[PDB]
Design a protein around this ligand. Structure first.
Ligand SMILES: *[C@](=O)([C]=[N+]=[N-])O[C][C]([N])C([O])=O
Lengths: 350, 190
């Protein structure tokens, strides 16, 4: 009957971009770990098998919902360096230099992944950090086979940055070329880092050897991340943004992410239509949705920022009254140029 | 970008979206740590009115500042039905993370598609600026005439996102789906 069928399981399940990492997640669940434990193990596993995005030197968000309904969000997003400045990415003419914000040592923010994972693990997990990091440790120490995804990413995107730095090239390049499908990727240095974290906890990263290595890498190349930055970093548990769509409650990430707010905003807008009637792929459904999104991105550019620095009008943005007023400016048989759309007037919704 | 979801035997659930930002970030390994460094600083508004790598714009709210966390679009998400965790999803895609998650939710609730169907369905997206109705291959030539007609400027492009989702049956049974757009991925359980 269906053309597409979901994978089925009766006890636990993990879905991720990498087969090895997913399997790491499942094995942890089978050992009696909880969703959070598995999630941290998967996160450390990806930092090794999916260096494209999985990481220890990046950041992100996490939404946790207990079996009892308790829903919370962990913000382990990166903090700009204390010595970071407003116009730091401007050239002499005062124009944004993409190279500076994407490839130089100035593009980096103090990483929050280790922090966020440990916060979630200590408060919501049940396994010690050393146990959930072990799978990733072995993968880095003993290596793994490069698959199509990694091989393709190394060639297409890796080529533009990895071979330009000696330590990076030594790890991901082989015989003057990016590792190919079938080659083995061993990350001895990462294994040592992982091994140290599993032993001295998250401080190994923000205060220990790893912190030193990060600070020196920046200092010797014009970066700003100092040991004070790494020591002054902290993951932050925040209240999820949520809404109600046709009787279903939706929970997502609140600022610093703009994710939560706008997904809810658009759903509120859409609620004012009989979407089901139009059906998937229909001309109408695509019409309505395309327009609703416009207003959201408009508001995004204006009202969204680190809540610890700016006040976001999230109540008004997710206010159904406002959403209903946005819905009316929508014509099922005619669009509205992004030019004739500006950040909404949240006044009567404050 | 990458997102993963987990649900255990007790019904606890976690959705995580994390990244270095662009693929491999700056491509700079921090000394002998073996750790690649992110280029998340580009998510800040380098200059009010000027778009970043994803075409996203900002002002003073998202301008560069010390100890400030740059604006993100990552959306690990959880939908609840009849008071119970029902859908756990999310996806990479910079600015498209928002409309990608949105379509997963709309596909599940409004069109009654199973998590695999909802995942394999074609996607579209509009971020105000640039002004265009970005689409993926998979939408009928006919339906597309109406968008161009009704007024939209359809712009076919690269596949959007990599949803990794799990749906929870009323009886505790788990249903999952990995995105066709990402190869070598996996949704497994026991
Ligand atoms: C990721 O989707 C990786 N890519 N391209 O970017 C996410 C972005 N940095 C965000 O919204 O935080």
């Amino acid at each position: 009957e269906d053309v597409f069928h979901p994978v089925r399981a009766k006890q636990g399940m993990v879905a991720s971009v990498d087969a090895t990492a997913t399997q790491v997640g499942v094995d942890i669940l089978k050992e009696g770990g909880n969703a959070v434990d598995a999630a941290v193990a998967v996160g450390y596993a990806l930092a090794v098998t999916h260096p494209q995005a999985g990481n220890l030197g990046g950041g992100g968000f996490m939404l946790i919902r207990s079996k009892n309904g308790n829903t919370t969000a962990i913000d382990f997003r990166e903090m700009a360096p204390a010595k970071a400045t407003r116009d730091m990415f401007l050239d002499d003419q005062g124009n944004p230099d993409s190279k500076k914000s994407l490839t130089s040592h100035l593009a980096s923010g103090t990483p929050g992944t280790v922090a966020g994972f440990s916060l979630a693990l200590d408060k919501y997990g049940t396994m010690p950090l050393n146990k959930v990091v072990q799978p990733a440790f072995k993968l880095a120490r003993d290596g793994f086979i490069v698959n199509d995804a990694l091989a393709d990413d190394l060639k297409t995107y890796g080529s533009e940055v990895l071979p330009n730095h000696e330590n990076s090239k030594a790890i991901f390049w082989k015989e003057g070329e990016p590792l190919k499908k079938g080659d083995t990727l061993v990350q001895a240095n990462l294994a040592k880092s992982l091994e140290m974290i599993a032993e001295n906890g998250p401080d190994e990263f923000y205060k220990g050897t790893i912190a030193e290595q990060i600070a020196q890498e920046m200092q010797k190349n014009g970066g700003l991340i100092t040991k004070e930055d790494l020591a002054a970093y902290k993951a932050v548990e925040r209240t999820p943004i949520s809404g109600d769509y046709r009787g279903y409650q939706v929970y997502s990430m609140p600022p610093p992410s703009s994710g939560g707010i706008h997904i809810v905003q658009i759903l509120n807008i859409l609620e004012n239509f009989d979407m089901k009637k139009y059906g998937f792929g229909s001309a109408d459904a695509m019409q309505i949705m395309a327009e609703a999104e416009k207003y959201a991105y408009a508001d995004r550019s204006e009202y969204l920022g680190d809540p610890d620095f700016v006040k976001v009008p999230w109540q008004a943005l997710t206010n159904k009254a406002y959403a209903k007023s946005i819905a009316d400016q929508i014509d099922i048989n005619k669009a509205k140029p992004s030019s004739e759309i500006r950040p909404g007037k949240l006044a009567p919704y404050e | 970008t990458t997102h993963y979801s987990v649900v255990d035997k007790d019904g606890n659930a976690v959705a995580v979206t994390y990244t270095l930002n662009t693929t491999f970030g700056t491509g700079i390994v921090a000394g002998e740590s073996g750790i690649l460094l992110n280029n998340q600083m580009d998510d800040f508004s380098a200059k009010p009115g000027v778009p970043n790598v994803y075409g996203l714009v900002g002002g003073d709210a998202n301008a560069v500042g010390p100890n400030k966390r740059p604006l993100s679009s990552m959306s690990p998400t959880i939908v609840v039905k009849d008071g119970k965790t029902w859908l756990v999803t999310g996806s990479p895609g910079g600015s498209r993370i928002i409309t990608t998650v949105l379509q997963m939710v709309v596909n599940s609730i409004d069109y009654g598609l199973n998590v695999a169907e909802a995942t394999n369905a074609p996607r579209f997206h509009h971020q105000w600026l640039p002004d265009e109705l970005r689409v993926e291959k998979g939408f009928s030539p006919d339906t597309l005439k109406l968008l161009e007609a009704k007024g939209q400027k359809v712009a076919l492009k690269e596949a959007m996102g990599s949803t990794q989702s799990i749906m929870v049956g009323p009886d505790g049974e788990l249903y999952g789906a990995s995105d066709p757009r990402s190869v070598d991925d996996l949704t497994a359980g026991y």
